[PDB]
Design a protein around this ligand. Sequence first.
Ligand SMILES: CCCCCCCCCCCCCCCCCC(=O)OC[C@H](COP(=O)(O)OCCN)OC(=O)CCCCCCCCCCCCCCCCC
Ligand SMILES: CCCCCCCCCCCCCCCCCC(=O)OC[C@H](COP(=O)(O)OCCN)OC(=O)CCCCCCCCCCCCCCCCC
Ligand SMILES: CCCCCCCCCCCCCCCCCC(=O)OC[C@H](COP(=O)(O)OCCN)OC(=O)CCCCCCCCCCCCCCCCC
Ligand SMILES: CCCCCCCCCCCCCCCCCCCC
Ligand SMILES: CCCCCCCCCCCCCCCCCCCC
Ligand SMILES: CCCCCCCCCCCCCCCCCCCC
Lengths: 100, 158, 480, 101, 298
Amino acid sequence: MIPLQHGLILAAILFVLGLTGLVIRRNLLFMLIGLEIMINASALAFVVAGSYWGQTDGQVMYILAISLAAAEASIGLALLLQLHRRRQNLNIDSVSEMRG
Amino acid sequence: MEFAFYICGLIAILATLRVITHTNPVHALLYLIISLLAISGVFFSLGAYFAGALEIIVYAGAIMVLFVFVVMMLNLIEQERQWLKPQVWIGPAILSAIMLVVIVYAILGVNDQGIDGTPISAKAVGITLFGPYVLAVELASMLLLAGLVVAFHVGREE
Amino acid sequence: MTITPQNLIALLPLLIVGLTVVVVMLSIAWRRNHFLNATLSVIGLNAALVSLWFVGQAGAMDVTPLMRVDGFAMLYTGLVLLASLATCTFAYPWLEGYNDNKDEFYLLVLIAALGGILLANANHLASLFLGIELISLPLFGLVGYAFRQKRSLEASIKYTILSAAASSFLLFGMALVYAQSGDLSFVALGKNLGDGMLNEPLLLAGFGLMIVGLGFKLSLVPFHLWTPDVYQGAPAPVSTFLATASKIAIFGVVMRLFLYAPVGDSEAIRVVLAIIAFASIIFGNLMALSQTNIKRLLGYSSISHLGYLLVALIALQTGEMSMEAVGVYLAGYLFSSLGAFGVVSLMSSPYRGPDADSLFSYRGLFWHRPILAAVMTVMMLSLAGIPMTLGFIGKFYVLAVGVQAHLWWLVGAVVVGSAIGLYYYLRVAVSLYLHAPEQPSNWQYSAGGIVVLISALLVLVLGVWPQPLISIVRLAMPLM
Amino acid sequence: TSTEVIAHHWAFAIFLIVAIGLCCLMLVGGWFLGGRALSAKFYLVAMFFVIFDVEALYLFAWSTSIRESGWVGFVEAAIFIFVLLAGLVYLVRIGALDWTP
Amino acid sequence: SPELIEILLTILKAVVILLVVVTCGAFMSFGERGGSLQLVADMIKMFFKEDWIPKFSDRVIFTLAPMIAFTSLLLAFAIVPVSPGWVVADLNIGILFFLMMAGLAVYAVLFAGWSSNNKYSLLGAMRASAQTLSYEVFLGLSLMGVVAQAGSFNMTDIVNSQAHVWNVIPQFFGFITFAIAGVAVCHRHPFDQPELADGYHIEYSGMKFGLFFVGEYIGIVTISALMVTLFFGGWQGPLLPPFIWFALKTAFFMMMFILIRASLPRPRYDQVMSFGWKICLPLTLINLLVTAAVILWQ
Ligand SMILES: CCCCCCCCCCCCCCCCCC(=O)OC[C@H](COP(=O)(O)OCCN)OC(=O)CCCCCCCCCCCCCCCCC
Ligand SMILES: CCCCCCCCCCCCCCCCCC(=O)OC[C@H](COP(=O)(O)OCCN)OC(=O)CCCCCCCCCCCCCCCCC
Ligand SMILES: CCCCCCCCCCCCCCCCCC(=O)OC[C@H](COP(=O)(O)OCCN)OC(=O)CCCCCCCCCCCCCCCCC
Ligand SMILES: CCCCCCCCCCCCCCCCCCCC
Ligand SMILES: CCCCCCCCCCCCCCCCCCCC
Ligand SMILES: CCCCCCCCCCCCCCCCCCCC
């Protein structure tokens, strides 16, 4: 009764919202937050695709996606803690000296 | 089932929109938790009961707890509000809008017989996970071990 | 399908690398011994090579709905394992200079080798996604292993953020493809489309998002800007492992995906990949023109060489020798980049600390270390495509595959980018034999030295005499 | 859709809204009526909780279908739990799970 | 119509269960403290007391934390079957829904500590949050022993699977780990106050403080009822009605929580984390492995 198209469009909306939140923010924490939004949107799209076909594979890919999201959130917050404890500044544009 | 799906999708979209524009980190994380709860409600509308339970247990109950922990220990760019003035988000917003309109053009035009909403239980997901998905399970434990090792190596104080 | 005992006899390198991970981890939990843990890592990788020989005694079979093991998979597994062994060998003097925990580096290197093996045997979207994450996140750890170093922390943050974004793109594309196809197997990606309906927009857009993620992973233009910063900031053995193992494993699974997907011979994806290959070759060669940093220069070089590989990939279904060309090119590129980043590793070893500069200064290298200057020159000529080297044999293979498929724009791009490459590679080599104005004693440094000399001897011998490697690659046919 | 399942859906929804409304009305009556007049170990503990929670989800999925998975599934969970215990042992011996050094 | 009076009877049963649970939590606040109207006395004392939000604090987070501390375990009660025909939601996920509410419960402590504009209260909240995460990490597996024996996430199916042998005997290690995890997730003695670190309930006064207290005792009601349902056969009894048996077993566990508070002493903070992780997590993994081997052998 629910269209697959509507669930896919909802996942796409959340994905592009996470992408623009990733781009527009100088603070690294909001960049990590936008990354979490994008990966949650991708997992939602996999759930919609799996539930449309009546298959278990969508929830399995969802489980793999949230395992990835947990590990990436852990690593990114470790890197953010390192940046804050070595520079006392979460500005990502200051971490830019390698260029050319 | 359609009613809950549409309200939860709308709540998730609205909460994400408040997430990416807010200035306070704790408030943004609270809106993100609200969006995760809405996404779990969407999962329960589709019949993916295990996915909704996992969206509350693992995403809102573990990962956002980690983000909240980091924000509290930071005790925290905020003052100027760069992302609010249109001269900063003029480009990225229309770029994301163009990407979204191309994606939803691809979405419109596919075979769509509708979603039945029959519950795919966690028992069947377990049979699949521990049937034809042995290497996904073992290497996913392997991946989480890798993430644990990396995050301890980087995030410890000394 | 389920698991048989013979399926376990078609799984040994994965199990060997995983058991090496567990054993090294428990040995770290026992005590913090750099020598013993590094040795356990290299014995585990060598045993995985011997396990590859043992499964070469066995046949080719589909071990899961996920995995498929054939000679294609064994060839790419061997390339990944050789890259990992070289990385550990270069990492030991570097980690000897590193005044912190050292064996976590080996644990992450082994875990990334496991992900490379998974990508080498992947026949399924779930396995491809898992292998990509399994080579990515240990590289998050390894690129910023020296997180107190400001350049390494910068490279870690850049690679972590950008690879998380690319993983999101790839996952979204996989979800759209599964929404269309209804099956995550490689062979079913387009099976439910017939009568010329192969160009369905949802399948194409899903493959486009996967192309964005994979082309980030392959340093393809315009997902290439991370490459010089991440290459320069990362530790030099980590740069070696990234440039060799990650790109080889991801391009192998991309080769398999475009081989068994029925949507692989759509004209739209072929044209997009042709544009990406053209831009990658030209942009990498042009951007490496005025580089005084060897690591950034090798990043741009990696962009151009993956453009050549993409040119070989486009001629898959039209031609026949495309996968053989990819194998020969991958062997030559593996040995060349191994030797190049190995010299970068040993001259930057031991690690001098987070505050000291890691500048290379290759000018005048002959007058204080002649043999490493000779090996650097040999690999510079190999990446240029000089006929006395196996890099030319790969260039000749991709040129033959572009001529057979009549890809004249890509052939002209190869020639022009080759000329620009001649300029900057020969500048690097003649700088090695210039005069420097002004400016070890272990056996693991000598092990890294003999590794780069062995790679030079292999690239020179297979440049003059390429037939053994050609016959090695040719027998590695997969289950068609 | 049976009568019992929609009755239970209505009962669950009423349970939700009565509980939330009772708490909100409790705080509203509290406010309206009356007379006016850090160390990195926290991040590591939360991170360990997240990782082991995802492993716990895999074990959750196994546990509900034991009779439909056979001894092969037990073996699968055996290497899974062995790697989990190896990681836990690793964290214990390296001092990661040691609040007091 | 029979359908309308059936759904209204089910709604009335759910509301009766909810009111009984709330009144039981408040009445056992009194019982942990003849004087039946004493509870009403403190109730209207906190009701009519003026409320003080700190001036330089965050209003929404400060107001939101007691709501979480109440509604999390209050909603977690909804899966518990009391008697045949007296369940609120016969969910397919069940104990997963309990795990969802227990996961959301940590935000009350974190939010209270941050919104209370005080470094000491913030440090105490981080300490308590680390503790409850350290015990929530094995709460689910301690219940997975029972789930593995029953082969389903449903609660009525678990109670029907307890029709001959109660799961206290085969899942005694699951019994012990779920008891410790239920006590620790409720932030009560001996896991009551882990605190330069002060309490995170400071700056809370009046009806918000009442919300925190009644939410803790409601969580005690929910944990004891789920304890009975999972490990002590639920409502199954030979002579008395099933409602009566469930009531006596729930009261039995609730006064044993009170007795554990009144008797046991408080271990140290690092001792609490070391015990939690190092003992209870490998013990629970081993318990689930041995349980699986036993059921597959039979
Ligand atoms: C009221 C107007 C809006 C007011 C403001 C927003 C309030 C919250 C709105 C979202 C949550 C409630 C949505 C409405 C649910 C009502 C019940 C319903 O529609 O149930 C249908 C279905 C029952 O299951 P099924 O067996 O599939 O039945 C289908 C036909 N027989 O149900 C299902 O399949 C699943 C039911 C939903 C999933 C469980 C509940 C999820 C709750 C998510 C909360 C998100 C955070 C909210 C934050 C609010 C503040 C911003
Ligand atoms: C008759 C027409 C039909 C036949 C056409 C045949 C084509 C192949 C044969 C002709 C090739 C002509 C090449 C001309 C440039 C040769 C290289 C050169 O002059 O390099 C010197 C110069 C460096 O000088 P310097 O001042 O030291 O640099 C600044 C830093 N110190 O170097 C530089 O500034 C950078 C050099 C970059 C690499 C060289 C340029 C390559 C361009 C593509 C070549 C391929 C052919 C394209 C078409 C050519 C015209 C038809
Ligand atoms: C501060 C407020 C925050 C937001 C609070 C909630 C807002 C919405 C409130 C109104 C909700 C109305 C009820 C919604 C429908 C309930 C029934 C339902 O979900 O039925 C669907 C499904 C049935 O499945 P089952 O019965 O097992 O199988 C047979 C299938 N016919 O059953 C299921 O899928 C059951 C699983 C889903 C149950 C969700 C219950 C609410 C969860 C959110 C709690 C939030 C707590 C507060 C915030 C915490 C901190 C952030
Ligand atoms: C096919 C490979 C061709 C290049 C080989 C490079 C290494 C050869 C062995 C070392 C030779 C070094 C010669 C240095 C001469 C310096 C003269 C300076 C004064 C004019
Ligand atoms: C910036 C560098 C640009 C390099 C461009 C190199 C171009 C080389 C020459 C390409 C010629 C292609 C001719 C294609 C003809 C196809 C005819 C098809 C007939 C059916
Ligand atoms: C009915 C009796 C059956 C007895 C034998 C049961 C076990 C047989 C099959 C064993 C399969 C083991 C698979 C292990 C996979 C490990 C993957 C590790 C990846 C790193």
